[PDB]
Symmetry: D3
Subunit: 231 residues, 6 copies
């Protein structure tokens, strides 16, 4: 089997790592995800991963209590590094070479993000996990995925979601769209600022379903899974 | 009254900020804690706080799955910074001046720990929250509390726990009122991690174990009044 | 009068500091700008400034030659710090207290950005210059201005431009072009008006950060924008 | 032929990258410089480059207006990093492996200078570009080239200039002639303008050979390396 | 023979590098030590070294004069980096690949400690010297050796000392004195034996990190400790 | 009296802190030096100090053994920070406000050098100790003193030496009283490293060479009185 992508940026939601309790990190659901990535690696795909922090930091309640927006996003930012930290470990236990990089330098914990060092690592069959989003508050994990995606010169961003693509009860799942077509039809693919970044840099986005078994493997094979977004 | 301590290091367990769900940060339980600290500040006490990360990172399950011990502690270390981040915010919302410092520099998020800058801040009626423990793995939050306690030249470390001192599971027990470092090792009592305890002992840093859940217990511990156990020599 | 803003984020284009030669930094055009800011400070306004790097780095030619986009923006990012560096100096020579902060820490050159430290400095009658944009490539100086603006809790972002606000059409080329006085984020997207980069605009919209586009070349226009008087366009909702 | 140098430190003036407009970076003048370096690399030479910032920051006018000297030099320092940034990119587009290092750490932009990491990189056929001078103000780009040159244990510093070596008299004074070799003592004695005195002292005290040559003279660089007689050499 | 250890953490006292004058660094005593390590490297052992700073900073006199304890330990911390700096150099002169890492980042001098980068380097036949202890004051070099030892996943910590192991009672002031050969963490606390600082010891115990106390002065003792042969005391459980 | 200098950069040799044993740091010789500086502070002088590392690192022997020159200078660089560390402490024990800055950032130990932050500190009656020289190898402590001197806009660099100024080991020798940069190069006099000297010359930074051992000599150099040699133009 051959893949239509040599280098991808896989974007996970923090919740993707949640267990039944609807929070934290579930070891098995995580090792499962490590294996899915091990496949992509073995198919010769260079994999950058960007994780969110929703499973470790909600903070909707703290926002309600009046918590400063910036401080809130800094907490989420750290949350994403815990997830990345866990994922890098999960991969090493799956005998996959992996590095964790952080937008916010964390001395002794993981190396600081460098677009160049990331490319170098990906070219050496290292999975590169990219943490702490953009380094700034008020930017979604999507924004970070696209920014990183563009920097590391990925062929595509794979937004792993709970839904099986972009949908028009009835109607139908789109199969392909354009950046213009998505704005025009007012479809919810991702945060508008993140979307603009991908559009302006002609970075293809594939929305798919991480829960649909082997869906990831298929998205890479080029096969029709979820929606693709290009132009 | 008059506080018998001009500078204390209050050590909280991460769980201290947990809600009913037994995880995360509960806004009300947190703002409550900010208020308790606002009191100590208003009494003219200089307050350093050291928080753990247990409420945000358990990772006993990940350890079970074979997660590297170092990576595990690094996750907890970050966890403690989220708690500190939350607490600093909670205090500013209670109109208390507060700084967050981290053993691991976090550019743009909070300033890097400096024993000197910490003292300077405490002397300016800033509550100083100390995050990311010692900066190293394999050191308990207790160890960090003592280390920081000694560095900032605190008069005492207040270990806030769920129990009312050193002794509701056996009808045959009695709360100590004061002990010595030697007396605690000898009687094999569980005050805190042994490495942490040694650090306090060797630097003659008094430890007060008390009950954060017992209302006003904190206020009392400071007044000098008899609350929980004291440990000196 | 009385300024309707206690804290503003003034966003300058790098070119704003250009001389006649259309590049670099012109000492007099810079000292003038320092004076304009000295006024706002004296009126008791807390001033954050965000500068671009267009006057020091073009690099359209290098992009044409195939230069990597990231590297290009990093060069621009450094460019903005040179401008900030020059501006902080110009202000100290105008006896205005000023700090330079950078999104990319520059040991010994200026302090690293911290939203908190920025607020603290503004509250102490320091002009805070914010350099190196967002710290990332592919983000405009506008994006940086809004992001910083929201972080330091500014009341408004003042986009200083060469035009006197937002026009129904273009003024410099069309005699039917007239000037809006106020718009809404929705109204700007709907009427497809060019206020600023879309990503930057979304940031301001989602955080209800008012934007005032005005003309830095129109003498005293800055002073007026602050007085609340009608200068250029305002954008709120 | 065979290069008489295994490791050199090439020192460029920022202006070396200027276009016709007398400022900025000209893509073509830069890509040709990348190609000149690609040659040295494929001759098996280890190349460290030190660039100035004159093309991106003049600031004589701002000095005149009273700008603080330190701030001025910090601006130039950043300027050199922009040049280095451009040069590293130019080399990668010429399929030459290259790293940018900065005396002032720049998180995420390029790695921090380390004399040791520099040598390691040079030994792996990486061109190592060294930016932000010495990290300090009041030190010329020449000073940085010598300092770096000594640190990375280069065999020679190649000061690329607009003139074809050191002349008995001012070239652009029709009665001038070109030296072929001098000594540090001979240069101070004859009061010749090779480079800033502080920089020169550094090279002298560490017996670091300096070759002044003409970057505009085609293939002059290739020749300086071959050992052939181009511009002036300075040793002892 | 065959080394019973694939990765060790060798802990030296700063004094280990002292000359006759009882201070500083003696080139020959250092090059000697570099050679001992070159052996371990050639036997295929991955070697992490942790050095103290006692030879370069005493400061008992400054403590006496009232010097702040923290400041004192920071001076010692820097001291250890000077030793590590010297040792890395000594090894390169012995044609041994070696990296210096510091708990306190030292831009341009050596790279910052990273448990992961340390392991990577050891796996590439680099000797990894670990400096500045734990990065904190009030922690002994022993504590640093154990912490590092655990982090880099060493099989054993080799505490090189002036004595030939752990003794029941002093061997030169008692004829019935028999140097232990093996102990347990519990056995050492129980018998109240001085192996190392209590905090450091607890760290090794809780992580089941074997400790071998031996004599660096006894020629070839190091080589033997590694061979598995019975030199000095071992401490496990 | 009235000091003819509002801001000075005092350059000490590391050896200046040596005891009888000819190495290390002698507590009393150090506290003595702290007091001399306390005076200058009390006279309203802003004091920047630059210390060398000779007392803590010789390394002529290690150079002889083939040690890399860079590594050697890095060791000395660290040495200077130990001295500065000791001096900052000595000053706080003499109730003098003092900050330590390093050309090489040392997280948690002391703050990173910033020419601006240095000036700010000096203007707030802080003695500012400047460590790790220029941050680079192959630069003398003199070079660092001048560079720092120029950056912090000092009026003068006071090179404290063992000799009482610049002299014409001789029966026939007279102490100069004032020279010029040109006059010093011309007469081939040993004031300081040539690179360092050039820096001071090109920036018209006055240098006063004097004798730290001559009691009250420092106090006098500041009063404007004739002590050791002055070098200007
Ligand atoms: N169990 C575990 N080991 C780790 C982890 N991170 C680093 N290591 C160990 O440290 C070694 C070096 O890790 P890296 O920083 O990734 O360096 P590397 O040479 O690129 O090794 P790989 O990236 O794993 O291929 C790894 O091979 C592991 O032995 C982790 O997250 N979990
Ligand atoms: N809501 C909120 N605001 C913060 C927080 N941290 C900093 N700030 C804001 O940023 C300003 C600067 O904060 P600091 O860096 O702590 O400096 P400061 O002058 O000591 O401010 P205080 O600690 O309140 O005295 C504060 O006055 C607040 O307005 C936080 O955690 N939550
Ligand atoms: N000429 C000039 N001097 C500067 C500049 N930056 C700092 N300084 C010097 O540094 C002193 C204070 O440094 P700052 O970084 O501004 O810190 P500060 O404590 O806020 O001092 P001020 O902002 O000037 O009130 C000033 O008095 C200047 O002498 C600059 O950009 N240009
Ligand atoms: N276009 C461009 N690409 C760069 C630049 N710097 C790094 N890269 C890319 O990032 C990858 C990693 O390069 P580096 O991290 O700088 O170092 P490296 O391991 O020596 O990689 P190479 O130099 O390409 O062999 C390179 O292969 C380039 O594709 C640059 O300045 N311009
Ligand atoms: N004399 C001396 N040279 C050094 C020292 N450290 C680094 N170097 C030089 O810098 C080169 C690179 O050393 P490293 O930074 O350790 O990189 P490396 O690839 O691990 O090189 P090795 O350690 O020799 O394997 C060495 O080959 C030496 O030439 C040192 O401490 N002393
Ligand atoms: N013993 C000792 N204490 C120090 C030293 N440095 C800082 N401290 C303590 O930490 C406090 C803060 O020091 P700084 O960082 O210099 O802050 P500061 O506001 O400038 O305070 P001072 O300089 O001491 O007036 C001091 O008041 C001392 O009590 C030192 O070198 N030795």
């Amino acid at each position: 089997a051959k893949p239509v992508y040599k280098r991808i940026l896989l974007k996970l939601s923090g919740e993707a790592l949640q267990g039944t309790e609807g929070f934290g990190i579930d070891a098995s659901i995580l090792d499962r995800m490590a294996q899915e990535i091990k496949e992509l690696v073995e198919l010769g795909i260079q994999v950058g991963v960007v994780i969110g922090g929703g499973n470790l930091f909600r903070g909707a309640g703290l926002a309600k209590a009046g918590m400063n927006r910036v401080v809130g996003d800094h907490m989420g930012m750290l949350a994403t590094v815990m997830n990345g930290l866990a994922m890098r470990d999960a991969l090493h236990r799956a005998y996959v070479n992996a590095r964790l990089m952080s937008a916010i330098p964390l001395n002794g914990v993981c190396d600081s993000y460098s677009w160049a060092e990331a490319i170098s690592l990906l070219r050496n069959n290292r999975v590169v996990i990219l943490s702490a989003g953009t380094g700034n508050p008020f930017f979604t994990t999507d924004s970070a995925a696209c920014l990183r995606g563009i920097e590391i010169e990925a062929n595509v961003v794979l937004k792993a979601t709970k839904v099986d693509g972009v949908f028009t009860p009835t109607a139908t799942m789109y199969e392909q769209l354009t950046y213009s077509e998505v704005l025009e039809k007012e479809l919810k693919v991702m945060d508008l600022a993140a979307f603009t970044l991908a559009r302006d840099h002609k970075l293809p986005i594939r929305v798919f379903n991480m829960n649909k078994p082997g869906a990831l493997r298929r998205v890479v094979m080029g096969e029709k899974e979820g929606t693709l977004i290009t132009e």
